[PDB]
Design a protein around this ligand. Structure first.
Ligand SMILES: Nc1ncnc2c1ncn2[C@@H]1O[C@H](COP(=O)(O)OP(=O)(O)OP(=O)(O)O)[C@@H](O)[C@H]1O
Ligand SMILES: [Mg+2]
Lengths: 59, 359, 74
């Protein structure tokens, strides 16, 4: 299994896993904590939300 | 053939190994000759460099513009690579083909003559254009109501006549990054100069053709730069050598007057709605492949299809075919064309009353 | 003669494939092939265009069908 990663503006690498995440935990649209050197899929992250949509939540 | 094919597989693996030994090289553009061993080469990355050349490269063929290969480590010129074709230009000229010919176009015979007097005549008879003294025309702005043949004519021109065609969508040029909405046009016009004759054909140009705003937003300001880049490479400080531009739209009113000037856009061939005798040709063309099963006198359909525009007649053919299917009959009947014509004519009221001004 | 040569060359093929494997390791960069030329006319050499904005020329391509590369092919 190979994953295509779209680092915002540095590159468009094609990368494998990093052994810290199950192969079924990554799906298209998810944000990946790609490793800095010898890039790898380490930690999936919550989907990006615009900050301006955050304070509109009464706590 | 065991041993021989195994040796062939060995040659393939050896080629893979040789590729594994090889390395890549950057690509730049030579812009100066400081000395016999010092050149000022640009790079696709963007920075300039002072690069020493090899010993085998012919120094004579090194002027402003020639593409060269740069070794990644020491930045040394290696090869003399020829001119470049941007991939977003090959992806434009490599359209399929188109199977329709000038026979398929019906009713349009005078406007076909007007277009061919600019597309074919200068490219195949540049002597009458000399003693008479006329300056050869450049632009042909096809325009008319939506759905009369403004695009089908371009497909016929691509199939017929010849010359290296370049189909150009309107939005297929605009990119997000700064300037790339104009670099694409620059390469489009540069490719033509190396492939004379060229019949560069934009389409739906009212996307990048709008009357330039005076207080538009940021988006409408970068497009205007593209309109400037397109505008200059037709009458600017250079002569278009052998490039003809065909230009199609549905709303010529929303076109920048600088682009509409006679001299940039020459004879403005207008494709009108089919008129009576023209519509009979459309009916004959579009209802010839269908399994006709009667004395198909389209005179009633010609009378009723008032204001019908081209593709609509094809839609009457399609709806008649559908109606024949509704009764499981395997071929359309002359009284089933009538139902389809009526059904399409009723829907024609949904469309706005098509209005346009002869420029 | 044929038997021993064939048996040895199958193993050497396995060796060549293994040597290929030690360089087909992730991660890769992604580039769009700009245009493929046969420089021998003046052996297929392509001109990739990396996402890092570098238009890197290649003396020759490998591990990929040289005839099955078209412009805008990731
Ligand atoms: N004279 C004609 N004879 C036969 N078919 C025609 C004719 N004119 C147009 N058509 C039909 O028009 C269709 C092709 O699109 P068409 O030429 O109507 O678009 P257009 O008016 O150029 O479009 P746009 O509004 O996007 O600029 C085809 O289905 C073709 O059969
Ligand atoms: Mg059209």
């Amino acid at each position: 299994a190979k994953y295509v990663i779209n680092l915002k503006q540095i590159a468009k690498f094609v990368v494998g896993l990093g052994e810290r995440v199950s192969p079924t935990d990554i799906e298209e649209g998810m944000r990946v904590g790609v490793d800095r050197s010898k890039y790898n899929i380490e930690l999936p992250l919550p989907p990006r939300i615009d900050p301006s949509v955050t304070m509109m939540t009464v706590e | 053939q065991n041993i021989r094919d195994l040796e062939k597989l060995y040659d393939k693996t050896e080629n893979d190994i040789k590729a594994l030994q090889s390395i890549g090289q950057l690509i730049g553009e030579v812009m100066k000759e400081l000395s016999e061993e010092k050149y000022i080469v640009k790079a696709s990355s963007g920075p300039r460099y002072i690069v020493g050349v090899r010993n085998s490269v012919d120094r004579s063929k090194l002027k402003k513009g020639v593409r060269v290969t740069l070794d990644i480590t020491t930045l040394t010129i290696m090869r003399i690579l020829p001119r470049e074709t941007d991939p977003l230009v090959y992806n434009m000229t490599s359209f399929e083909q188109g199977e329709i010919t000038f026979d398929g176009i019906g009713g349009l015979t005078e406007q076909i003559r007007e277009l061919r007097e600019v597309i074919e005549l200068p490219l195949k008879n540049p002597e009458i254009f000399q003693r008479v003294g006329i300056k050869p025309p450049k632009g042909v702005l096809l325009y008319g109501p939506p759905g009369t043949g403004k695009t089908l004519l371009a497909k016929a021109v691509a199939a017929t006549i010849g010359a290296n065609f370049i189909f150009s969508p309107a939005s297929g040029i605009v990119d997000k990054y700064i300037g790339e909405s104009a670099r694409i046009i620059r390469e489009m016009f540069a490719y033509a100069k190396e492939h004379e004759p060229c019949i560069i054909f934009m389409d739906e140009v009212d996307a990048i053709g709008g009357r330039r705003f005076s207080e538009g937003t940021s988006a409408d300001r970068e497009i205007q730069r593209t309109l400037m880049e397109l505008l200059t490479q037709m009458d600017g400080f250079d002569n278009l050598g052998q490039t003809k531009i065909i230009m199609a739209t549905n709303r010529p009113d929303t076109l920048d007057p600088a682009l509409l000037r006679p001299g940039r856009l020459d004879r403005k061939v207008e494709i009108p709605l089919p008129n009576e005798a023209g519509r009979l040709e459309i009916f004959k063309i579009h209802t010839a492949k269908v399994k006709k099963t009667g004395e198909f006198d389209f005179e009633a359909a010609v009378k009723m299809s008032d204001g019908f525009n081209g593709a609509d007649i094809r839609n009457c053919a399609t709806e008649a075919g559908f109606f024949a299917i509704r009764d499981d009959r395997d071929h359309i009947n002359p009284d089933d064309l009538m139902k389809a014509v009526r059904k399409v004519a009723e829907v024609k009221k949904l469309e706005g009353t098509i209005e346009y001004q002869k420029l | 003669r044929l038997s021993h040569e064939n048996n040895v060359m199958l193993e050497k093929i396995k060796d060549n494939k293994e040597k290929i494997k030690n360089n087909r390791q992730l991660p890769y960069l992604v580039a769009n092939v700009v245009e493929v030329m046969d420089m021998n006319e003046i052996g297929k050499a392509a001109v990739v265009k990396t996402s890092s904005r570098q238009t890197v020329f290649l003396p020759m391509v490998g591990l990929v069908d040289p005839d099955k590369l078209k412009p805008n092919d990731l």
